[PDB]
Amino acid sequence: SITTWEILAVSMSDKKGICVADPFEVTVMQDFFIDLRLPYSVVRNEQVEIRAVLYNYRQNQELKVRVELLHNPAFCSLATTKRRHQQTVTIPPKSSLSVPYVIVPLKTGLQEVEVKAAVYHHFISDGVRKSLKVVPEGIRMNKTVAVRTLDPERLGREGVQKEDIPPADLSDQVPDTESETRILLQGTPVAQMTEDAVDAERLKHLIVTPSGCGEQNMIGMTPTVIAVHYLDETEQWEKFGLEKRQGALELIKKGYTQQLAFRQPSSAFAAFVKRAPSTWLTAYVVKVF
Amino acid sequence: LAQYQKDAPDHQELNLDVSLQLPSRSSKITHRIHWESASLLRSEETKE
Amino acid sequence: SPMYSIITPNILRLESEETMVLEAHDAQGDVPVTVTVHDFPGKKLVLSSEKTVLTPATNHMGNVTFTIPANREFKSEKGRNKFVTVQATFGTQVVEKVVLVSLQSGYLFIQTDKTIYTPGSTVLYRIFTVNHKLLPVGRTVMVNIENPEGIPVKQDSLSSQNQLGVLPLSWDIPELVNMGQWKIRAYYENSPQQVFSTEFEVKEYVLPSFEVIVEPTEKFYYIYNEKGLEVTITARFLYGKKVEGTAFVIFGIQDGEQRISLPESLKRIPIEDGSGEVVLSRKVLLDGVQNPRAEDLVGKSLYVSATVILHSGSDMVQAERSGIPIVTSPYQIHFTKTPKYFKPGMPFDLMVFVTNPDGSPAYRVPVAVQGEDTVQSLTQGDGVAKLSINTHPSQKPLSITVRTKKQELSEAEQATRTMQALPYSTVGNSNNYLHLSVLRTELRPGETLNVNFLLRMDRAHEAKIRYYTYLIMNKGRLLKAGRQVREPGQDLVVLPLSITTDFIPSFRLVAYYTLIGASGQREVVADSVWVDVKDSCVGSLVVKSGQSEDRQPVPGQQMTLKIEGDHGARVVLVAVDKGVFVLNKKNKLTQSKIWDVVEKADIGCTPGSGKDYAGVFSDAGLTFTSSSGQQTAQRAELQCPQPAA
Amino acid sequence: IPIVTSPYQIHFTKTPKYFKPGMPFDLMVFVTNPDGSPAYRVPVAVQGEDTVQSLTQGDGVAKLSINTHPSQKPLSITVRTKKQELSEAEQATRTMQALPYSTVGNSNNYLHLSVLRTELRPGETLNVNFLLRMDRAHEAKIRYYTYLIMNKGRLLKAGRQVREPGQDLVVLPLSITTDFIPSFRLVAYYTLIGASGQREVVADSVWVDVKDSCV
Ligand SMILES: *[C@@H]1O[C@H](CO)[C@@H](O[C@@H]2O[C@H](CO)[C@@H](O)[C@H](O)[C@H]2NC(C)=O)[C@H](O)[C@H]1NC(C)=O
Ligand SMILES: *[C@@H]1O[C@H](CO)[C@@H](O[C@@H]2O[C@H](CO)[C@@H](O)[C@H](O)[C@H]2NC(C)=O)[C@H](O)[C@H]1NC(C)=O
Ligand SMILES: *[C@@H]1O[C@H](CO)[C@@H](O[C@@H]2O[C@H](CO)[C@@H](O)[C@H](O)[C@H]2NC(C)=O)[C@H](O)[C@H]1NC(C)=O
């Protein structure tokens, strides 16, 4: 191909990291050449025009060119094996000349087209062989077969559901052509069933320092212990303050250390060690702990 | 209110096991749908 | 007693190294320090490694490192915030703090061989897998290819371990396809919520043989220009020779996302010597709009569409220039690189960012403060100008307005911007400050930079200041930290800092001192500044020609590709016709966009300074917590707060 | 073509030979190739402490600095290059001795100037920094500075820079024009009646190189 190429280079170093280099440009060129500019696709069995452009970049020399379209079994033209389709043209210097040809596509697919040209009194020549798609007449259609709901509890009864998809009837289909069937599945996103929790605005007061007797230490430790667990599961430490969970952790640890000081030697609890042990308070600490 | 959250109720209960029986039928395409794939698309293409 | 101190970033990342800086202040003798990382909330213990000893020979310093693993337990919550807890025990006194965690683990960059493809062709694509340090990492990547309406058609899962962070893969486009924009999306396995993407187009085309350039004389339009907007046309063949043809060009107006076309703006010019020129006059534009006010035209934008055909008539290229602003001002002034917090009674530096109306940086334009015409300065290469004021000890905010003074341009053409800076708050209004000052140049690796530390306090407490503590934040992690000692009477000290390749593209320096002053109270005063570094490769890959002669080689000829680069590096290649890029040059990856993605991932939000010592660290992106009790502000949001604009 | 042990030549030619006691001091080190052409991007360091290192700019000048103590004794300064692969016999070195400033009546009241070190082109701005050092009883008496510019053997520009109390540092931007080519000197001073009622003058100066080009 005659153009300027742009080369992109990216390096990967285990110590110097990724580096995307500056693009390097290489201009590939010949002084005399052809560029056959085909369409991407052509309708089969309809006569079309191809445009072959021939370029002359001498600064003071016009050139006599014999240009020829070659015979093709897949494309009908004036070029046959006995009789060739050739012309004799003249290209002025620092200019380009376009030579039209007319052809007819004969068979479907990506078929071959070839042209050549050579100049008189110099031995510089060029040939261009490209392929272009011969498409049968017709157009793309993306119709929908079916759109239906799946629910095995609701449809088919008792958690089992069977459902068929017939193929498309497509009587307008072009003969011997591809036909994809795109199947898609997407679940149903169901949400909510959650009520609003308490916004933790007025819950900032329940941090109480434990103090006093064993029951009184349990009174002061009572709102501090439950509030951390509520704010853990409601994750409202963003509004409340992340520093206050560590501060409450010291008060919960201080409450437990003070709670073990009123422990009876038979693993029981009361306000004092002199007092007879309380059955209800023993059950309440087990609920708290 | 903590036990109301923590393991809070939610409308999702997806546990779908869907399988297809192909025209080529060399294998049965089978996928699963749960909560992490609730809004996930699953697509397959044929050539016929 | 001595005060123990821990400094870490605001936000910690999964699957990457995290720097932990331990210091003790005013300390005597050795103190052992044990380090532990726990989860939040509760206690499951995620990391119990590392310990060190703060020594007076090392000025009670100690930097230790760790790495955060991620498992199925860590990756569980994907949508809402979660935190962890850092524990460091200084002798018998423990200091701990809850830290915000980001779930990001690195970067993914996707290169395609073309920006636009045909039905029935192959797409070649390489995925580069790097960590946060832009170094190749071996992880499992999940890649998906989606349709124009968002349907995944092909998906992959592969690890790049022992492949030097390169995943070369391929896929064929079917002929049964919907033309339009197609998207490739990718994410790491251990970070599913961080999604990377790049786009390409599918169309039915053949490549053109020439390119058309549409060049406005100025990349904006001034409304009261009687001549109007001049747009020069340049057209040449792809191998570099001049195009002879005839161009058809039409103008239009873009208001928001909606485009309006001006039909009578059409002209027909021949393209001679590879060039042409067309002018849209002021009368035709006002005749095109039905609103005769010139004031309502401000804020909207123009676009140009050209259609050029060769005089052989065998090829055709359509080009487009768009986004040309209709403005009263050929410049845009921003305080985006200026800190919003001044030091009362201590001079303050202004870094003024001036751009062209499209957004490109303006070069060598003189700007001045609105107060006093004597203080003027011209912009440097990156569009930054240096101004400064001599601040009074006003505890009231100080309004700063900057206006350009470029010659010949009228006062309606002079841009201006107005902001309001805020005073630094000292601890207990002690009026004891720290002021940083530094050179403002384009920084290349290998240069030295003089950092200046100015102390302001009463002389009864100046003898208690024996050191400064500095840290360097670069790319969201701590790169370097240390102490700079000070003898009495040396209110200014200088520290030379050598620039290496690790400092690219931008870094923040923080510095502080501490003492027990006033009525026997611990005081912390800090300062910070943001510095831009010239965007370049960490390495240096260059591609050039091996041959020195035979200019424009023949088709098919052998030539020598010469590749100079860093030793030990792996290089990937692709060679593309430029006619693909004339059709579609969007989404091309480059090194400047890589540093732009890293700068968009920065956790610092302000160009230095702050409302106090805590605001200095929080705006820079750092957390501090001391044993006495002074600590940074809580931050539970990963993103930066948005300016009022 | 010189036959040498050293591929570089270190000179203190652009460094002042007089230091300010107890105030940090700047070193401008001029390094050349053996013919005399300026060396590019060679790292030099002070002999005392390996931590303070810097590389030369385009004009062969490197920036080093020390944090000076109030020694009334002269201070020896030795600079040595640290360029890699080259042996210690190949590393150039130079040794000088700087001299202390003498204040009026040993009052220890100084003036310190500091400035950026870049290649200066016409049209750029240059921040000039004025640091005052004195006791606070006389800091309220210093209300102004007096500056002058010497270029090509004649005075080019001069003026006053006012100062408010508590503002020991002030900054003055200087725009570079074509008149400053090829090199110029800035002087600055203040004055007051201090100590026991005695007139005192304290001054400081610096020499700046400008990029050689046409006016
Ligand atoms: C058939 O395929 C086309 C794509 O070729 C699809 O319709 C497109 O929908 C997008 C919006 O997502 C529009 O931007 C395009 O203009 C549409 N294309 C058209 C109208 O050709 C869709 O899959 C199918 N559409 C129809 C109308 O059958
Ligand atoms: C933190 O400690 C590490 C110790 O591993 C330091 O790394 C060494 O630093 C010294 C001096 O900078 C170098 O001479 C060594 O070569 C480094 N070690 C290795 C293995 O390369 C690190 O510099 C320290 N960082 C801070 C900020 O204090
Ligand atoms: C000394 O006085 C002369 C007066 O002739 C000053 O020249 C003028 O300076 C002002 C302000 O710089 C300019 O606006 C004028 O245009 C100058 N006059 C002319 C005729 O051009 C000169 O600047 C003064 N120099 C100093 C050092 O004070």
Numbering used by the authors:
A (entry chain B): 776 to 1064
B (entry chain B): 1257 to 1304
C (entry chain A): 1 to 645
D (entry chain G): 324 to 538
Text taken from the publication that reported this structure:
The C3bBb complex is the AP C3 convertase, which catalyzes further C3 cleavage. In contrast, properdin (FP) is a direct positive regulator of the AP and stabilizes the convertase by associating with C3b in the convertase and proconvertase, reviewed. FP oligomerizes prior to secretion, and in plasma it is found in a mass distribution with roughly 25% tetramers, 50% trimers and 25% dimers.
To obtain an improved understanding of the FP-C3bBb interaction we here also obtained diffraction data extending to 6.2 Å resolution for the complex between C3bBb, SCIN, FPcΔ3, and the FP specific non-inhibitory nanobody hFPNb1. We then fitted the relevant parts of the FPc structure into the electron densities of both C3bBb-SCIN complexes and the structure of hFPNb1 determined at 1.3 Å resolution into the hFPNb1-FPcΔ3-C3bBb-SCIN complex. With respect to the hFPNb1-FPΔ3-C3bBb-SCIN structure, TSR2 could be modeled in one of the two complexes. The epitope of the hFPNb1 nanobody appears be located within residues 267–281 at the end of FP TSR4 located close to TSR5 and the TB domain, and all three complementarity determining regions (CDRs) seem to contribute to the paratope. One proof of the reliability of our convertase-FP structures was obtained when we mutated three residues in the hFPNb1 CDR3 predicted from the hFPNb1-FPcΔ3-C3bBb-SCIN structure to be important for FP recognition. Affinity measurements for the FP-hFPNb1 interaction performed with bio-layer interferometry (BLI) demonstrated that hFPNb1 had been placed in an overall correct position in the electron density at 6.2 Å resolution. There are small differences between the four copies of the C3bBb-FP complex present in the two crystal forms.
